[PDB]
Amino acid sequence: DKPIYTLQYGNVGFVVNPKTVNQNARLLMGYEYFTSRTELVNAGTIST
């Protein structure tokens, strides 16, 4: 309902404060998002 969008309220970050960290630890991040670009006039006409 309110997508994270920097430029709307400064940089935002996802945070994890770990209690235990084993060797080769890492966070695998998965994102779902919307993104553009400007639209130019449409092609496709077929003469004949």
Place this chain on the structure above:
Amino acid sequence: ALINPQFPYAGPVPIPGPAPTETMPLLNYRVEGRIAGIQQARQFMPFLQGPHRAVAEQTYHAIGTGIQMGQTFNQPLINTQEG
């Protein structure tokens, strides 16, 4: 709001506030967007535009033919009454 004397509500949030960041900037987006795939003039449907008959009327063709032919039997003659 209620203010109570002598414990008055500070007259402001004052100058001791902690400015936490300068991240205030929304960087303007600059972009060029092109949706240009060749379009072909046609789509296929099962049916578009038809106003199908819910019942038809009964319909027919016509013919006649023949001639005028006949076998006849007549009433007998009778005595005439009056006149």
